């Protein structure tokens with residue numbers, strides 16, 4: 001819950017805002033060749049001392065204290081504006097610095113109740129190792145080659161996105177990634193083109209893999225500077241990084257050199273440029289809701305101002321991490337908005353994911369949306385519309401408006417282009433994220449059907465659990481970095497196999513999840529590697545678990561190539577059919593559900609009427625979670641000539657067969673997507689991908705030992721097939737027909753694994 005409570009701390013902070021709020025835009029360092037100016041906002045301080053150093057830490061060669069200087073109160077018409085300033089004449093680039101701040105707290109201003117704290121700059125743009133000393137940098141020197149020609153990659157519509165949620169270490173830490181020794185688990189991994197599995201040259205990994213998969217967007221887990229990895233320590237350390245230290249400095253551990261402050265800036269920019277060169281939008285995970293500790297640059301500069309304080313003097317702990325940032329305060333609001341603008345402008349970031357956005361006030365969020373709109377309204381914003389504990393806040397903001405938290409409950413007060421994670425469809429698809437053993441729709445829960453069905457229109461049509469204003473305000477997903485991976489929950493909730501073990505029924509459920517995500521409105525989102533059955537060995541909170549547990553297992557692009565192909569195809573379907581990628585509510589009344597949206601059912605079906613010329617006229621979608629094939633008759637009989645474009649085997653833009661009438665046979669634990677024949681013919685939307693069909697046959701009888709699968713990819717790109725992992729160990733491959741490995745062609749190729757009797 002959140003609580004409106006006014007106290008001595010909130011009153012003091014409000015009075016500080018009225019007298020001392022500063023909008024000068026020049027806090028921190030203003031560098032030029034001829035002089036550097038330093039500015040610190042601290043109304044509570046009795047003095048601020050600047051300390052210059054040759055190095056970011058004392059252990060480095062050439063490390064020494066240069067000198068210290070007294071900052072002076074900044075006067076405007078002889079009135080103090082709360083700012084401290086000094087200008088050092090000459091060339092000061094590449095020196096390091098801290099401030100020594102002698103200060104009261106917010107409730108004892110003018111008293112002699114002072115303490116002195118040493119801290120890095122609140123407005124640091126660079127630091128040395130482990131973020132303890134700021135660095136004076138010419139940011140133009142940190143620009144990689146071609147950076148001036150690097151542009152934002154922005155989606156016309158947020159709802160046309162396909163988001164891959166990725167940790168920078170996870171991306172390439174696996175030696176099988178084919179990334180060079182130097183760059184594995186680093187920013188620079190993204191700059192390596194032509195990477196293949198085990199560097200064997202047969203099938204793409206990393207950035208080339210992402211190009212082939214066709215994701216629009218990569219959302220990167222924390223790459224601001226966090227506390228929880230020792231940047232001078234072992235390469236085997238792992239943390240998600242939800243432990244902020246410096247908001248406007250890149251994390252050191254993902255760089256080749258954290259000791260020189262400029263290197264991580266250059267390399268972070270190189271990562272972003274490489275994603276842009278691949279045609280991929282970059283979204284940044286940001287965590288303004290809390291800092292690692294209250295022994296922070298914020299608390300050491302203006303004690304008790306930047307955090308929400310309870311009447312009893314305790315820090316409000318709405319984050320569950322010990323503190324919460326006071327977004328309702330004039331100078332934290334300004335800090336956050338200025339920070340967002342900085343990452344967009346300086347680093348070419350294309351959008352943001354707000355950690356525990358429910359701890360941020362609606363007015364601040366809306367003002368941030370308006371700020372980013374002035375750059376480009378296609379810059380994306382979304383976040384978690386919840387908190388991690390009870391939140392204590394003042395009644396009103398620094399603007400004098402009533403405080404509202406940016407939660408699901410308050411979606412109507414928030415901009416429709418600040419989207420909110422839809423836990424409705426997430427839990428509906430695969431079961432409660434809070435319990436890995438819990439079943440959702442794909443595993444056979446009939447009561448979960450309503451979660452899926454509301455999810456289909458991005459929880460914007462009617463009300464189940466919460467209501468989005470529009471599809472633009474909804475992130476559609478079945479899993480993220482938190483809790484269990486999709487495939488781990490499937491395995492745990494069914495007992496079908498061990499974690500990370502292929503099972504044919506588990507894989508069917510995984511394909512069905514794919515069909516649902518890409519036939520639902522809202523912003524389609526996946527954990528990186530969901531498309532290849534990513535496992536964390538059942539770990540439901542992997543934030544500091546082993547690097548090799550967390551890392552993407554690149555062998556899975558082969559072991560689950562068929563599943564990758566299914567996702568690849570479903571993505572094509574969504575991007576081809578306008579109703580699915582609508583921002584607004586235009587298409588809400590164009591859906592005809594066969595059963596009530598609320599129905600307890602094994603078969604969900606609906607049609608969608610389109611109005612875009614040159615596209616399919618109508619789509620039929622069926623989800624079957626039964627363990628048997630079902631005959632499903634649509635209530636909408638307006639179309640009786642259909643072309644199937646997704647089934648239990650494959651998804652894409654090509655005809656998989658036709659259906660006359662209103663009844664479809666839907667295999668167990670599978671989806672059907674069909675479109676009107678007339679529209680299919682007229683639109684001329686067709687696949688340019690090639691296919692490989694993989695068969696598994698008992699040589700002696702000619703009978704299949706396992707269902708055939710379909711691989712699908714760009715013509716001329718490399719594929720690798722393998723024997724079926726689920727065939728009993730009492731059969732072994734004796735012969736292969738066709739090419740187990742090769743390049744896709746337009747005409748479908750077939751590979752048959754022939755099996756003989758064996759004892760293991």
Ligand SMILES: OC[C@H]1O[C@H](O[C@H]2[C@H](O)[C@@H](O)[C@@H](O[C@H]3[C@H](O)[C@@H](O)[C@@H](O[C@H]4[C@H](O)[C@@H](O)[C@@H](O[C@H]5[C@H](O)[C@@H](O)[C@@H](O)O[C@@H]5CO)O[C@@H]4CO)O[C@@H]3CO)O[C@@H]2CO)[C@H](O)[C@@H](O)[C@@H]1O
Nearest residue numbers: 319320321356386387388389423432433434435482483541
């Ligand atoms: O600080 C404690 C906590 O922090 C982190 O948890 C985060 C979660 O991992 C993350 O998923 C997110 O949690 C959200 C959740 O996703 C969202 O769905 C909503 O949760 C609801 C449930 O949907 C609802 O079922 C009910 O949950 C019950 C649960 O069913 C029952 O089995 C039992 O465990 O009690 C639960 C709570 O009563 O209610 C919850 C809460 O309303 O909201 C959640 C946020 O509150 O964000 C979490 C916070 O960052 C860590 O990962 C975790 O290890 C720590 O324990």
Ligand SMILES: [Ca+2]
Nearest residue numbers: 225226227252
């Ligand atoms: Ca760090």
